[model samples]
Target chain A: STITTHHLTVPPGLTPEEFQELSSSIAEFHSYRINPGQCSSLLAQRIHAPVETVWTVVRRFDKPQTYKHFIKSCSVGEDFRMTVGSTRDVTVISGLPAATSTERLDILDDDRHVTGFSIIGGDHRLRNYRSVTTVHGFERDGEIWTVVLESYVVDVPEGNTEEDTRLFADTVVKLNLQKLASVTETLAREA
Target chain B: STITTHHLTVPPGLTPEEFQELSSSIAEFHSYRINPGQCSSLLAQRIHAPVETVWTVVRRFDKPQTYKHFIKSCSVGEDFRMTVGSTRDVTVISGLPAATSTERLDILDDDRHVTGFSIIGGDHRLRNYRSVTTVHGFERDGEIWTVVLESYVVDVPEGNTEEDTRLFADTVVKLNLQKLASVTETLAREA
Candidate 1:
């Protein structure tokens, strides 16, 4: 049986129109069918910036370090061109279990403002990581603000429960999204 | 299609034998099958007390306020006896969305150190709430310690996503388990 009466959380400060816009964007792009042994979750952040301004940072498959703080440095190989099949090698900052990560871009749609990546190889414990990030635009008090939602699924490591794996991953992603907002809002203010 | 090489997190300080014991208990009692609109998570705590002391608090279907801090008071009717199928009416403390809850005892296993309950009615938004709490005993450095794990599933309320509901629920449960450890450890010391 399916439970159909409810859906994802509308974030705390969204207006009715903003909620509607974010809801539609989520329904269209942020869906995950989590299975046993794998945990999945989605987080939303409201940014005081235009959608285009936010997407410019999210669409950078070659430049995730622009927003993701855990990434100390990144390289997408010599022939890389930030496409759907391109891969990147990233050196991670210390203080976590990971040292380096090899990731592949799975989706990059500029017109629709959606992007995704998968963790293919890493010294880290986040096995089978897949994530999607989306940006939505709506008017608030005559200003175009953006809403971003990121969803991810990763395997529960050995001796670690799904809860443990999710907490670690969620903390990292939350930090990344917060930094994304800080950077994009600054860019918007300057523009 | 099932990932079989991994399991739940073993808390940081558990010995190999303690990990094996807790893993067996979790596998036997702490499995959850989350559906599309529902969110679920499990949390564990290491208590410097005997399993029996912790179970005494957990199995009290009529008195959850012993460790569950959110419960301001509870009543299981005049004909109440702590058994499966028993029901309780509880008043939740302020500072949360919930004010009252009607709950039913689904399982009470004194022999196995496991108990479960379902929240059938409440003014709060946590619909279809089901939870299980298990306590395991293991020896470390010639001292017996208790490990308690609690797992739960609740519907994702309208306008709220799974992550939001999970964070709230996990925070409450984590606090309850910490209080459980505190109370039981004091009792153990007195004993």
Candidate 2:
């Protein structure tokens, strides 16, 4: 249930100073290590295009490839494809070590919602940890686009034994969220 | 998951003897405890009416009232006055002693479903149990009608703890169903 959310405004209307202020505020408030390193991470990115366009791109963002640059050492595999029964692997940087994971993505087009969960390996306390991330896209002033990413991380007790796994999973999720925001920003700029 | 469903039929041009046989068949199966006692009792009275008229009456029966009657002895409060959020004292004729319980009823008209739950005493374990019963009504041929009833019991660990409460509640539900059938038969015969 440990959750942290970061909100950043798009450029033109949102300057680098504004984004930095918002990011620093989030980091400052969420500095404590509740469970070694696990914590829920949430990031909101606002763009100048319609929310529908941002939603289309965010929902289809490739995790292993497009998101790898910011997530550090990670690779997308056909074994970890994006489907109902698919699973993915994630490699952690620093002292966290490396691990393979399985994931499932359920796409809700009518509501422009994308939900996904992953299973992480190693660290007995962190095994079978399922993380659910949901993306909600909305339009403001009929033009400004906003996409909010909300996620929940829980230890698959049957899959993971560590009580601290929830905390570790949460921390990793926050770090990954920063990467998601960066990638989405770059993709919007390129488009 | 061990589900058994019985379909009661009054064949075209069936005589009183044939109807009696059908009723007997149901009585035999009653030992299995499949029919809620209330439904069984009601059916006993209504079985003499024309099948079509009995079907119509049962379909439009006052479900909340009938449900209350089936569980009358189990309840601690006045049967007719109980409303949502009302607490009642209930004794599991089978498992535990009489405990104070609160009831909540959810009526889904569009889907033809009725669901009820009770929070007995302050026991957190008995608070999350819910019992759902659904009846689908249909008309067949020129003078034949039918109603199908299905029941489900679930326990949400995060919500309540009355795991066995559903058993008692279901018993009452079945009895009421029988009562409904009996009343319908009476009305149909008079018509």
Candidate 3:
């Protein structure tokens, strides 16, 4: 069974112009195909920095430790070069259910400030894990602000309910995005 | 008193196309107008990694220690989000003849992989110090490589010769770029 299954929903309420502006990026980069046994979710963080600033953090395929609090260190098996197809081995701090994870960068568009990666190997329970993060900037009162959207899909372990799988994954994603906001905003303000 | 004098130069010989491609960015970002009382120069480093990879290291206004070996630590006076107008106070390691430097970021363009900053205050001899760095990527044998150009302008210390000023600045820039190349290439190979 190599075929996969997938989503249907009312799009979030947005002004026509706003949705139009965002829909293309969402449809192109955020949409994910999932299997019946897997779960997926989307989350967003508003960063009080310019898109470029937030992107600098998101684009570090080799340095997740820059903002990811759970990551103690990271390295890639081959020269990384931050290009697509590069993979990183991340060592996590203790107390988590997992110790290490190996991830591959699937897409990185510096022009768009959008990047995506997936977990291919790890000690954790997550399987078929994939994540995409996109940062966008807008102006508010002559100041720049960024909104980051991160969406992920992963399989539910046999003993785990979809809700439980989502709960855990969502918790981790939210926390990472929060740290991203804190880090990006602090740097933005200081700059 | 505010008038600035500038340069006449033989462009680096490139295979017509190469020089054509690089010249625009050079003229746009890497050229510094200097006064008779100031010194200025350009330096370049070839990195055997993709441009994005090198940029990840260079763009970290908040984290220069990622590659700059002389930096003991860095911090911004305010919250910094890698935006223009952000300033940082950098502490140098012992033996560098400097204790600290306060700098302001003048430009940070993620798409161009270009940035510029100026030293506004420091416990060092460099005065009216400003620098710009530009990164470009080209493919050779189907593999990506990056070339980074950094140029700087600074006033000649009253007691120092222009040669002394250029010598010190060039040495620091060369060492920093060398470290940048090593770091970027290593990460590129590993990933």
Where model 2 places Cα greater than 4 Å from the true spot, the runs are A1-53, A60-62, A68-81, A106-111, A120-125, A156-171, B1-191
With candidate 2 superimposed using the best TM-score fit, by how many Å does residue A153's alpha carbon deviate from the native? 3.4
lDDT tens digits by residue: candidate 3, B75-183: 8756568789998888764222225888899989999888988998878536898998888898867977888888888888776567656766775677578779888
lDDT of candidate 1 at residue B135, scale 0 to 100: 84
List TM-scores for all candidates, in order. Answer: 0.47, 0.32, 0.46
Candidate 1: where are CA atoms >4 Å away?
Answer: A1-6, A11-17, A96-98, B1-191
In model 3 chain A, which range of ten residues has the least summed lDDT? A1-10
- The local distance difference test score of each candidate is 0.74, 0.39, 0.73
Between candidates 1 and 2, the TM-score winner = 1
Q: Number of the top candidate by lDDT?
A: 1
Cα lDDT of model 2 by residue, A1-191, tens digit: 33244343332223454456445433433222234334443434444444455455555524544432212334455554445554444443221122333344433333635555555343323443443344434443565544434445343343333333333444344434444556666677787
Task: Please provide, for model 1 over A51-118, each residue's C-alpha lDDT reduced to its tens digit, 9 standing for 90 to 100.
Answer: 89999988889888898764557987787787888898887642222267888999989888999989
Q: Write down the DockQ of candidate 2.
A: 0.01
Clashes of each: 6, 36, 24
Model 3 chain B weakest lDDT span, ten residues long: B5-14
lDDT of 1 at B155: 78
- Clash pairs, candidate 1, are A9-B160, A9-B161, A10-B159, A160-B9, A161-B8, A161-B9
Put down candidate 2 lDDT per residue, B1-191, tens digits, no spaces: 22223224442233354345455433332212332211111122224444445434433322333323312244334454424454444422111121234545433232333323444444323324444333333333555443424343333223322322333334445445555655665576676
